[PDB]
Nucleic acid binder design. Structure first.
Lengths: 436, 470, 470, 436
RNA sequence: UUUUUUUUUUUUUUUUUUUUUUUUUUUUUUUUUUUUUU
RNA sequence: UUUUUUUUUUUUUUUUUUUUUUUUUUUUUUUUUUUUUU
């Protein structure tokens, strides 16, 4: 049944929106200031810093960074008669812990935490990707496309584990392998047993993510090495460059700004009654009547900022630019010529130059975002023997194979997925590559 | 942590200063004679000749050069009632070996050796640069700027290897390549294996010195030649003329005269307690209250000699003249019109003409000297995606950059020639003589100790000449 | 070094004695009631029930036995004006967990746990041995002498594993073998892997316990059976009846009553300073000035109770009665005619009949208790040469023992049956009830502290009976 | 030329005999007491403890074992009117160092040191062999025959290295391998370089010791492992059990008691003039007119003691018993039923029971002792491939192949090796095995 | 015609043993009592 | 119909670099001097 899942997610987002309502009540912010992305961003890093129970335990025994008992950051942006000012207001974790507890009807609301942390991962992937660490592990910078969910820490659950990319898992496992190579860390002690356990958990997440049998079997055989040394490093690099084309079935969770939920809940649109979905039309139509204000530099233009915000909201920064333009109805500029900077504001930037303006989120069309792979795969002793079939499959692969047969782009006016329209692009080589 | 490094360097320089104190005690020199650069210079060549264990072993089996059992040179300069006299006093190595051993609390003090030999390399680079060898290998004399640390022999460690210039490594590797071309020296014997090993050690020092990925990769591919012949010669010449603009991150170690440390230690300024640094304010403030005497020819002027000594001390002979003038506060004369000669005195020069006088080392300002590079690389490579991920479920093609996909699992033979040149040339064309470097850093005042607030310099004085040679 | 081990054991027993002091403070018991064995016994079953983390986890998911959340038993015995009364006072585990944590200076003190559980095993072996289980597995009741450390569960560490007898391991392994025979439990799952692991751990404990090479090799070959069926059952029974004479080197850990440590610690005798030992004179001299009170039935006599308590303290219930009498200086009555019962009191016994009195622990002599074996193996195997080397250059054959040369590179299948039996049987026939053991060691006097001069005992008192059971 | 070697060894043994003469002069011992093996044995451990410059340096920095500045042991045995008494007389090293220096005409006489330490190794091999260490390394006790020169430390030179057995080298190399396995000792430091150097020196000694090409090649390939781990352990165990039959050409150096040389030198028999040899008739004829007294327990018999002393002198404890009996002319009892104990006397044994008597060293015949192997060998990727030829050679080997063709046992009266007599034994299976 | 190198604690009570070693959890048991009974 | 584990120091000045690192020796050179000469 799907009604129970819809009711659960509706209750969750209703609690999130009511928490947004109460923070707006408590912060004494104006109507416009309640529609600012920066305030929600800072509040949600406060959120993660309050439920990072592992880091809370680590920092209680580590009183450093000066004035850091329970309070971090808090750069609240406020309006005086047109101008803007930031105040470093410090909030302790514990009261916000109870305000959450009262916001979800006595529950912890860890799932909502997973969705907010994933949405932060989505915005991070949209804005900046780290070839720095990618080459710190020595892997080439030609796989920036598999850094989805890279900023997500381990503390997230299965729902968080679903959206992390294959390359993110590759980076996380190589970190553990290099740590176990630097020092003899795999002893029979509890630490070795626990890192072992985390290793097979991440590995069966990996093998669940893939679709073709060959890569699943080679991941199975990579496990057979009780002592991860150097050979497994190139083995899993080969796994990664095979997943470049033999991509894993990774989900795309559609989370939206902290405000969008709050504005919807404030207006009285109860999500429990009519039901809510995370993959269907829902996050599209909530943005059809949503107003969002944002802060922009004197050199930054808002036109690219709105498109980057739509990237962050729908996690389409790793998709083809042509398709995103089709759903937008307007051309989407690649990151090569974006005359904009990161959404977050640096701690040293002055305030006389900063200017607030609206963001456009309206899209002409809507589409389903399933956790499936291209139809091209369906059309098609050690690790090297399977690398042979990897190579022959790569040779069989073509840049022409059309995927996603039987599905299409839909119009906004339809609600039950009745009749789509088939898109068709013949616009030469505009560039289907967000980076470069 | 940085406290441990500061304590170590403080202990080292304290031992050096105490050795200077004991040499002053043993040589029966006066107070003024203990502030002479020449005495410290001769004593420190004695130092290197005593720890040159490789050369010690080579000369024990090679008893030549007449009276040379254990003693070399030793031209000690002394004052009689205003006049000067040199005595060729010969000191054997071994007693000075034990005096060092007692000076560093039972330790060998090889790091201090590295800093003194680097400081000799700094003074040599400041005074004279060898286009003679630069054209002996056939390389043009336009690259005299990359002869930093040229006089440094191989015996120095990693700290010594950090300050050697890119051109110094180029010269050292071309020497080995020419030796291996003259005779079939790369055999499977131990000599070939050891020269091979030294070769990759010098090469990963090189690739550590650079900053941009293209030159690191081409250095990696130069290694793939198991038999260094003629092609690698022009390959590494191209590497050098690329490093002319794509300069390597080479450190600048701030060593000071043998006396300056001794005078500071004698006064009781313990460096272990308050800590010491080699890059920060430290060598600047020690020179703020340091007195130095030097020997000058009857034709030489002391005004340029003091500036050349400041060059040698702070290894700023390869820097822009305008900046050095700004920190000095006075104009720094380029080597074209320096009416002076080398600091060291020739063995045949007479003594009635020689005159001793003070040197000025005070500077109006101070600045940090990091081992970083300046704005150069621009629009060379931005990686870029190779694959795509389906976010929306739309019936569409999945664009794959196939020809690079094949270059990821296999590949042909791009080569080091007619391939990396395009990138090097493209980057050189993108480079401009206008690009300002070192953003976010500035020149500081002496009165500040914690790097609080700098002042931004600005020169509009036409074309005074930012070129020490020529 | 031995000083560190002595300091560690001294700290451990000091913590144990301080915990005894604090329990005496908290229980509001009198001076006499603090010298009762029963109170310490009940408190120490509370101790084991509080650190039985495996059983704690098993019982949290199994809430049975009525009122059993965290509290078990607790029959505290108290005096009213001469008479005695038991109260079933229930203590939860957790507060005693923290009181331990504060008693060992923030440490868990698991080693002390091992020694107390071993001492409970020692008293259990002294009082009652189970031929019930010995014949439940079908093994004959003739081997009651190898039930040392039988009550010890697996949770003990290596120190606990050292004192468990060979027969205890035989029983534990036969239990696992019968469980694996009843059901197909050796699957490739985690349970099979873990029971496998515990099996080789118990087996290398076994082979470490033995001394002669033949039994070690046959234990090695018993391992080669991946599927323990029926043949291994008689194989290891043969191993056990061979260890009857070819006894294993099993240690004898000298633990003493919960009170004895507490009284010693209360008086201020710090064991860390002067050092402590578990094998030497130490537990002997602490009992030389120790007062112990105990509970005795109206029919039980205290004379045999004191001797049984000395058995339990020094784990000498499996030794020769004559030797124990010699160290005692008084005759030790065997269990055949002991007009006494178990030390522990049944839950239904009335209190008007129960009477408290002192126990005698003074011994005339003292002896070392090493984990060595006695004279047994004789004319079993002397290796011998297999090859020869030509010393003189003489035209002669080179004798090579070829059939063993083929057995050194290859081999058939000798088997564990009809092969090692011959050696075992041969050695048993070579064994005699006359062979004197422990040459070079003797019984010592109390007044000596450094093991200077012993006295050689000599018994010619016919056949008084060197057999505690029967 | 061989005259120079003969002159050198004659000068060396003349110096040794003159040092024996001077020790007899200095110790104030009687004529009988100068013919006791125990006195020479103790004096020669004093000798080795005085030239053990490595141990001297190690003990100067390690002042332990109570009163041990420069003096060790010294249990001198003396006669009072028939009875015997031991005195623990302590001699410092340094004066004996100069007395040596004056005894060899200003030279160190390290070669003589090598021969005395080898002769101690010979007596140790004759008396007791250590299966204790042989099984400490885990090797089976079925190779006690290859423990020749086991007690010899590394300090000996090439002459000492020649007589050490193959099994001795196997034990020494396994010790280093186990030490390098326990800790990461093969670093680029000087210690690793020096242990490396000692390793190839011991290995080319090994490959020089062997005769057939297959084992030399497999020893060459064992070297190719830069990191000696576990596989090389069984590799070299296979090497050892192959050398069981494919024995190495190990020399047998004929050293004699400290006294025998002294008595010969005292009588005026200059060895420089007539020449001396270590392999030929020489040590045989010097024992033909040598008188030796020894100490015997009240239960020990002198008949087996004399034979064991002849074993120690001629290092024939690892040879066939039948051949040794033939040269003796009397039956040689194997160690199984020797009702005797070690030659050296324990420090706690009482003196009222001890009795001194003569030893018989006369032999009916004499034979050359070359460093060659049996004629049976002349009649005949990894380590396992060569193990295959090892197995086939072992199968080709027979316990019947007669060796040493063209050589025979000689009579005493002949001096120039003119005519031998061929021995022939048909005495069933008396037992050609000294142990077991 | 083939050769003196040194790296943190060992060995002569004796002849084949003896020696700085460790908290894992899987479906119902046990203190009426000492060798049976389920 | 698929899920909150914690182990010794990191990160919001910014968008693809920058950062606790080390004594090896092989057949004849060099301080009359500063860019030639052998």
């Amino acid at each position: 049944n799907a009604t129970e899942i819809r009711a659960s997610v509706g209750k969750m987002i209703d609690g999130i929106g009511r928490f947004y309502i109460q923070m707006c009540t408590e912060l004494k912010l104006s109507d416009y200031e309640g529609r600012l992305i920066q305030n929600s961003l800072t509040i949600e890093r406060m959120v993660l810093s309050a439920f990072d129970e592992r880091r809370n335990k680590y920092l209680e025994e580590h009183p450093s960074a000066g004035k850091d008992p329970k309070k971090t950051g808090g750069p609240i942006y406020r309006r005086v008669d047109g101008k803007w000012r930031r105040e470093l207001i410090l909030y302790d974790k514990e009261e916000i812990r109870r305000i959450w507890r009262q916001a979800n009807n006595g529950d912890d609301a860890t799932a909502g935490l997973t969705h907010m942390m994933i949405w932060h991962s989505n915005l991070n992937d949209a804005t900046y990707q780290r070839t720095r660490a990618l080459v710190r592990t020595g892997m080439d910078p030609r796989m920036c496309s598999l850094m989805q969910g890279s900023t997500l820490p381990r503390r997230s659950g299965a729902a968080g584990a679903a959206v992390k990319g294959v390359g993110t898992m590759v980076m996380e496992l190589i970190r553990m392998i290099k740590r176990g190579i630097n020092d003899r860390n795999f002893w029979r002690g509890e630490n070795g047993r626990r890192t072992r356990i985390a290793y097979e958990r991440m590995c069966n997440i990996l093998k669940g993510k893939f679709q073709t049998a060959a890569q699943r079997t080679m991941v199975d055989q990579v496990r057979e090495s009780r002592n991860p040394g150097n050979a497994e490093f190139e083995d899993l690099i080969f796994l990664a460059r095979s997943a470049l084309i033999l991509r894993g079935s990774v989900a795309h969770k559609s989370c939206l700004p902290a405000c969008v939920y709050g504005s919807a809940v404030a207006s009285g649109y109860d999500f429990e009654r009519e039901g809510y979905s995370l993959v269907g039309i829902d996050p599209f139509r909530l943005l059809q009547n949503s107003q969002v204000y944002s802060l922009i530099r004197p050199n930054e233009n808002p036109a690219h900022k709105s498109q980057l915000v739509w990237m962050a909201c729908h996690s389409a920064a790793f998709e083809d630019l042509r398709v995103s333009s089709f759903i937008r109805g307007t051309k989407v500029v690649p990151r090569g010529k974006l005359s904009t900077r990161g959404v977050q504001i640096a701690s040293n930037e002055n305030m006389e130059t900063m200017e607030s303006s609206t963001l456009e989120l309206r899209s002409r069309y809507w589409a389903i975002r399933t956790r499936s792979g291209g139809n091209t795969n369906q059309q098609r002793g050690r690790t090297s023997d399977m690398r042979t079939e990897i190579i022959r499959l790569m040779e069989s692969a073509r840049p022409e194979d059309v995927s996603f047969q039987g599905r299409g782009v839909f119009e906004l006016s339809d609600e039950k997925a009745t009749s789509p329209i088939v898109p068709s692009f013949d616009m030469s080589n505009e560039g289907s590559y967000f980076f470069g």
